[PDB]
Ligand binder design. Structure first.
Ligand SMILES: CC(C)CCC[C@@H](C)[C@H]1CC[C@H]2[C@@H]3CC=C4C[C@@H](O)CC[C@]4(C)[C@H]3CC[C@]12C
Ligand SMILES: CC(C)CCC[C@@H](C)[C@H]1CC[C@H]2[C@@H]3CC=C4C[C@@H](O)CC[C@]4(C)[C@H]3CC[C@]12C
Ligand SMILES: Nc1ncnc2c1ncn2[C@@H]1O[C@H](COP(=O)(O)OP(=O)(O)O)[C@@H](O)[C@H]1O
Ligand code: ALF
Ligand SMILES: [Mg+2]
Ligand code: NA
Ligand code: NA
Ligand code: NA
Lengths: 985, 285, 27
């Protein structure tokens, strides 16, 4: 169905789109087209589903079971009205309460959904994308929404293609189609058309794809809504999975809980049939048990956690795409960091140089006045010539009246620094671009590690084209066969290579990036003037070049970085630098920001100290280490495993992007969760494979900021730290609540089982059970979410998902075998005191149901020889049920402040949460209000309480309080742990 | 699958876990029994902590109710044995050989006496004296009543009882022509019981009014009460009354209500057993 | 036991507990 005009020639493209091959478009015209077609962002869907979506959430589980139970209650009440005459309210009330619970739950989940979606919507507009258009002959980095149809647009590697373009000029440009093809493989891009099909041809770039490598420039054939790709981004697109660790353990818990609640359910239904209860009562009992063992609250709780973390991330500017991933970030036991742009601020100005076996400097003040060595030397003229010609960046439009240091530049940090330094120290770079006409070009690739240009011979005595090339100083040193000395060539010596290395140490030691520079006055006889040049095929010799010299600029880390690394290494998170920059530079930066600490010598430092060859030094004797990319290339999986495992502080240097990838994968080969922080396009493969990816929103590329799970809109590295901290809290808070809810279960289930063992009068009722499970688990389980991380300071190092989850099998042992049991024996005690206080000694109480539950036998005798009627001893009964509710409410206090803190005693945590206190007080108020309102003895069978009955419960709750802090004090004193290994949440 | 040996099940000894649990649970049980025995402070063996819940006593019956109903035929001994064995079982404790001299029984008046209080609830005295009730009291209706027998010609006797609430003293109401018309009821020391059947608008008057007991008075004498508890007064015996319908129109069920009027006694709405005694009577052939 | 009295006490209590809840909640 797609149509196109790609077949149309560049001059027919000229006439059709009235633009310019290189001069770009008129600003006036660009505003006219902007006013004509409107912003080039796809008109969004509806919303799509509005607030009616809340209905589904109101319908859905876990409340679904509450809904089935409620409708089963109303059904039961209808059946009870039909059969026999029944004054009792029974269910009815029950189904009402259940429905109300569901509705309230829905309000919660919808509220937290509202906050979370407001945040996630603000995050989309916090950072707008941008496009590099060409207008008035000059380049502009304008907003991505302001690109018009038919203006020229450049798209270096690492950028998203801002609209659908017809490539009129490109070099080595491999774009990634990704979504349009479904293929991860990059596809080359040239001005020539190859297929009638617009999707497969190479002259057509399209929206929502990104240029992996090389450079290109094209006229915008399609803007905004009506782009070739613009149909699938809304007509079929959506959220595409899949799994999230914390959420996965969440669902696993849900399946487990469902399983136990239904097993107990049917089991207690057969017990009901053996108890000879009526079906009308047996189903209500079933509903009771199920609604009991199943935490409604886990869901709303989770939503709470998510929303909270979202607010907190909103406050420190770090965007997270996937909320759950924040937890993943906490679980990180190894951060892999790129150096330039990441640990550093990717802002640079040239400080030092090296030519003619001499160290020169460039003044950085104002000034710049950077020579300071010899403005007249010829070797500086060649150096400056390379630095200017080989540089691809230029100043942005309307920037000429500003100081060179202070004007806006379109290019990477290195080339920008060069640009400013030549434009200031020597002369106008643009003028020397125009002087030395660039005939053919090689794009810059990280993979390639170098960049070079071939320009004409404007000089009268250069009787041929001139090649220039800058890059990794070592590749340059390799490729050369001679060096310029005072303007006169001279082959490479041992002396020259030694001075090169010594100067590289001297300048790299200051943590300065060391760009190497060389050139080649090509042999005349070898080629004529109109010789065809080949970028795809290497027709041009890269060897035997003429070395010129070195240039270095100071690279300052961001302020927060050393502190961040400090916190993470304080966090038991291994910090590992992975850069393709200089081995010496990355070592220095590492020492600086604390990836490598003093006193931890590398093998080479040891070889220096001990005056012995590096190979003689025991590699295990060594703490830290730096790995050269070349060594990495020849690494077996096993040897990387070794380096990674046996060395504490690790810095990878000279690494290819795939080597970043393999590094991360080696960290994943250890079983460890890894984070990846970066900026560059070449970070993307590394930050993809990661368990959690982080990228600069400013300094980052479009590809790597796409790929990442977390974007720092403020470029603040420290945001990672709080990030992981949040992720602990989530993993921490959730677990806490879980603990609490389970402790509610045992004392709800036990009475029906003790019921079987001896004919002991009913200690609680179904209505009493739901009373507990609703008053005692709605508010509190949610309130747990609001607690801050105790100490928490983890380090204690992040726990393996394999070691312990959100639902530890150990958690259930002190949740059921410890707390639950106590709440239970408390309940049974209070019940025995009630029944004792009414003439029925506890010893007398077993064997009673035989006549107790018997309706027509009113001759029941107690220990004091009193004859009780059915309705009297039943009143007594419901007055034993009522406190069991109240009493567990009393004991649930303890559990709340116990689950409030996992680590340090509840005194070190503080009271903090108002929702927790709110939970205590409104739990108690619900108890009271349930027991003393009129008609409650009839409605929910809740007969009012004798004052003493409230006090009965206390001892046990105190046993809880004491025990768990005897516990927490044992954690405190010893980490060896006996219970740490048995009763840790 | 649970791997073995190298794992040794889910872990090797693994003894101190079981030990920490039998220790902690024995501790928690020590706290449970501890709390159970301190609350066994306790309550005086002489009285329940709270009588308020026993309320005014409900009105009980001896021919053991099935569903508060009685349906049977004369012809089958088995038809009535269901009520016979229960009436004989209950009245086994009332045998004249069971009531004996040499304590704790002492004869009390054939004529119904004054409120007899054995003393304080304290245990300064031993096993306190208990007035005994001979089977001869309930009777009349030509020849004999009890123990039972069950002839159709009318009905077999329906014996009626009152709950034995600890230390309860029965109060007969004073008046001048109460809502009830209890016939052979003397004003003091009486506990009135009278039977009316099936609502008010449709009395149907299907049952004739005849009752009998101590002094031939159709109610309870205040000479037995108050009870001093199964502890202070084991082998005590409770006052006994008998309700007998001479006519009961064959082959029909008919609800009848035995109210026990008084200030001390109270009717409950939802408890049909409290302060009154409802029963469905139906004899058939 | 008794009646009215503990019903009232419990009632005023529920009221105070609940007011406390709102008060702490609105802080
Ligand atoms: C272990 C012992 C020695 C320490 C005492 C602390 C515990 C056992 C105390 C504190 C609160 C007390 C309870 C509070 C209220 C009542 C109701 C009362 O009508 C009977 C006693 C009873 C049930 C008490 C039993 C003993 C008790 C549970
Ligand atoms: C924040 C929580 C954990 C603190 C616990 C202390 C409070 C909630 C406890 C301790 C004493 C208890 C009260 C004891 C006495 C009475 C008087 C009675 O007429 C109603 C019950 C009531 C009101 C109890 C309710 C709960 C109670 C007030
Ligand atoms: N514009 C450029 N042209 C040529 N070489 C460059 C350029 N920028 C950086 N280099 C060299 O490439 C090396 C590594 O490249 P890469 O891994 O892509 O990024 P970085 O070093 O900035 O982390 C650096 O050591 C640097 O000297
Ligand atoms: F320092 Al880098 F990619 F930015 F190796
Ligand atoms: Mg970088
Ligand atoms: Na539940
Ligand atoms: Na609990
Ligand atoms: Na529960």
């Amino acid at each position: 169905v797609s149509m196109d005009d790609h077949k149309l020639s560049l001059d027919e493209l000229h006439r059709k789109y009235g633009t310019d091959l290189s001069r770009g478009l008129t600003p006036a015209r660009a505003a006219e087209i902007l006013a004509r077609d409107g912003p080039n962002a796809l008109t969004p869907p509806p919303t799509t589903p509005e607030w009616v979506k809340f209905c589904r959430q109101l319908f859905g589980g876990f409340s679904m079971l509450l809904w089935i139970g409620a409708i089963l209650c109303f059904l039961a009440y209808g059946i009870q009205a039909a059969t026999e005459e029944e004054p009792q309210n029974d269910n009815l009330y029950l189904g009402v309460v259940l429905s109300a619970v569901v509705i309230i739950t829905g309000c919660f989940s919808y509220y937290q959904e509202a906050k979370s979606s407001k945040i996630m919507e603000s995050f989309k507009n916090m950072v707008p994308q941008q496009a590099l258009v060409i207008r008035n002959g000059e380049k502009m980095s304008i907003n991505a929404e302001e690109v018009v149809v038919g203006d020229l647009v450049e798209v270096k590697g690492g950028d998203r293609i801002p609209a659908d373009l017809r490539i009129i000029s490109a070099n080595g440009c491999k774009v990634d189609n990704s979504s349009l093809t479904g293929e991860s493989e990059p596809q080359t891009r040239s001005p020539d058309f190859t297929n009638e099909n617009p999707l497969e041809t190479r002259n057509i770039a399209f929206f929502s794809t990104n240029c992996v490598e090389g450079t290109a420039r094209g006229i915008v054939v399609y803007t905004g809504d009506r782009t070739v790709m613009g149909r699938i981004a809304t007509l079929a697109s959506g959220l595409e999975g899949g799994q999230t660790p914390i959420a996965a353990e969440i669902e696993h818990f849900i399946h487990i809980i469902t399983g136990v609640a239904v097993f107990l359910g049917v089991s207690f239904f057969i017990l009901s049939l053996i108890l000879e209860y009526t079906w009308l009562e047996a189903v209500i009992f079933l509903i009771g048990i199920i609604v009991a063992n199943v935490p409604e609250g886990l869901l709303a709780t989770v939503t709470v956690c998510l929303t909270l973390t979202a607010k907190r991330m909103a406050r420190k500017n770090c965007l997270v795409k996937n909320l759950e991933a924040v937890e993943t970030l906490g679980s990180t036991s190894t951060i892999c960091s790129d150096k330039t742009g990441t640990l550093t601020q990717n802002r640079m100005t040239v400080a030092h140089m090296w030519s003619d076996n001499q160290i020169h400097e460039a003044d950085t003040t104002e000034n710049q006045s950077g020579v300071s060595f010899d403005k007249t030397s010829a070797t500086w003229l060649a150096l400056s010539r390379i630095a200017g010609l080989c540089n691809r960046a230029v100043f942005q439009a309307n920037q000429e009246n500003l100081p060179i240091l202070k004007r806006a530049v379109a290019g990477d940090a290195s080339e920008s620094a060069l640009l400013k330094c030549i434009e200031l120290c020597c002369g106008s770079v643009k003028e020397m671009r125009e002087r030395y006409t660039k005939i053919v070009e090689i794009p810059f690739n990280s993979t390639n590690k170098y960049q070079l240009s071939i320009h004409k011979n404007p000089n009268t005595a250069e009787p041929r084209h001139l090649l220039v090339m800058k890059g990794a100083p070592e590749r340059i040193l390799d490729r050369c066969s001679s060096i310029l000395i005072h303007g006169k060539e001279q082959p490479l010596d041992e002396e020259l290579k030694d001075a090169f290395q010594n100067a590289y140490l001297e300048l790299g030691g200051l943590g300065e990036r060391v760009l190497g520079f060389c050139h080649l006055f090509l042999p005349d006889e070898q080629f004529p003037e109109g010789f065809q040049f080949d970028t795809d095929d290497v027709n041009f010799p890269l060897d035997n070049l003429c070395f010129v010299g070195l240039i270095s600029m100071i690279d300052p880390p961001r302020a927060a970085v050393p502190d961040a690394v400090g916190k993470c290494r304080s966090a038991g998170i291994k910090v590992i630098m992975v850069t393709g920059d200089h081995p010496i530079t990355a070592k220095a930066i590492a020492k600086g920001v604390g990836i490598i600490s003093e006193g931890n010598e590398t093998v080479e430092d040891i070889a220096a100290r001990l005056n012995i060859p590096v190979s003689q030094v025991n590699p295990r004797d060594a703490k830290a280490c730096v790995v050269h990319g070349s060594d990495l290339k020849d690494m077996t999986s096993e040897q990387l495993d070794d380096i990674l495992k046996y060395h504490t502080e690790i810095v990878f240097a000279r690494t290819s992007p795939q080597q970043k990838l393999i590094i991360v994968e080696g960290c994943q080969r250890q079983g460890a969760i890894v984070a990846v922080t970066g900026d560059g396009v070449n970070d993307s493969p590394a930050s993809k494979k990661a368990d959690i990816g982080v990228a600069m929103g400013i300094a980052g590329s479009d590809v790597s900021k796409q790929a990442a799970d977390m974007i720092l809109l403020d470029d603040n590295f420290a945001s990672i730290v709080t990030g992981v901290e949040e992720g602990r809290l989530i993993f921490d808070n959730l677990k806490k609540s879980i603990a609490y809810t389970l402790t509610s279960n045992i004392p709800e289930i036990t009475p029906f089982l003790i019921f079987i063992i001896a004919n002991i009068p009913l200690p609680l009722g179904t209505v009493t059970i739901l009373c507990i499970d609703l008053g005692t688990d709605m508010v509190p389980a949610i309130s747990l979410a609001y607690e801050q991380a105790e100490s928490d300071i983890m380090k204690r190092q992040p726990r393996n998902p394999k070691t312990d989850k959100l639902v530890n099998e150990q958690l259930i042992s002190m949740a059921y075998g410890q707390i639950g049991m106590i709440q239970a024996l408390g309940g049974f005690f209070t019940y025995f005191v009630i029944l004792a206080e009414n003439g029925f000694l506890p010893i007398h109480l077993l064997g009673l149901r035989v006549n107790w539950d018997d309706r027509w036998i009113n001759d029941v005798e107690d220990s004091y020889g009193q004859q009780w009627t059915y309705e009297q001893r039943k009143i007594v009964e419901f007055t034993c049920h009522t406190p069991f509710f109240v009493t567990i409410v009393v004991v649930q206090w303890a559990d709340l402040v116990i689950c409030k803190t996992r680590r340090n005693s509840v005194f070190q945590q503080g009271m903090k949460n108002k929702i927790l206190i709110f939970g205590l007080f409104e739990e108690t108020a619900l108890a009271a209000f349930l027991s003393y309102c009129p008609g409650m003895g009839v409605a929910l069978r809740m007969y009012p309480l004798k004052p003493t009955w409230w006090f009965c419960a206390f001892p046990y709750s105190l046993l809880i309080f004491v025990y768990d802090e005897v516990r927490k004090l044992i954690i405190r004193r010893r980490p060896g742990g006996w219970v740490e290994k048995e009763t840790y949440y | 699958s649970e791997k073995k040996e190298f794992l040794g099940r889910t872990g090797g000894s693994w003894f101190k876990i079981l030990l920490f649990y039998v220790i902690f649970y024995g501790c928690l049980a020590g706290i449970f029994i501890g709390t159970i025995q301190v609350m066994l402070l306790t309550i005086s063996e002489f009285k329940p902590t709270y009588q308020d819940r026993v309320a005014p006593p409900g009105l009980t019956q001896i021919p053991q109710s099935q569903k508060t109903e009685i349906s049977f035929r004369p012809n089958d001994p088995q038809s009535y044995e269901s009520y016979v064995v229960s009436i004989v079982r209950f009245l086994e404790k009332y045998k004249d050989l069971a009531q004996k001299d040499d304590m704790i029984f002492e004869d009390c008046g054939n004529v119904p006496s004054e409120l007899k209080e054995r003393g304080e609830y304290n245990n300064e005295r031993g096993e306190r004296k208990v007035c005994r009730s001979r089977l001869e009291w309930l009777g009349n209706c030509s020849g004999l009543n009890d123990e039972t027998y069950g002839y159709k010609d009318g009905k077999p006797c329906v014996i009626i009882k009152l709950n034995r609430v600890l230390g309860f003293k029965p109060k007969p109401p004073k008046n001048e022509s109460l809502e009830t018309y209890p016939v052979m009821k003397y004003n003091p020391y009486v506990l009135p019981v009278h039977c009316t059947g099936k609502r008010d608008e449709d009395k149907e008057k299907v049952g004739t009014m005849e009752y009998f007991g101590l002094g031939g008075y159709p109610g309870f004498p205040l000479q037995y009460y108050p009870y001093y508890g199964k502890l202070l007064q084991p082998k005590y015996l409770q006052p006994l009354m008998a309700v007998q319908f001479t006519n009961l129109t064959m082959d029909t069920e008919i609800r009848i209500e035995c109210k026990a009027y008084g200030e001390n006694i109270g009717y409950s709405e939802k408890d049909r057993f409290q302060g009154r005694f409802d029963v469905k009577i139906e004899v058939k052939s | 036991y008794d009646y009215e009295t503990v019903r009232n006490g419990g009632l005023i209590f529920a009221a105070l507990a609940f007011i406390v809840g709102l008060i702490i909640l609105l802080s």
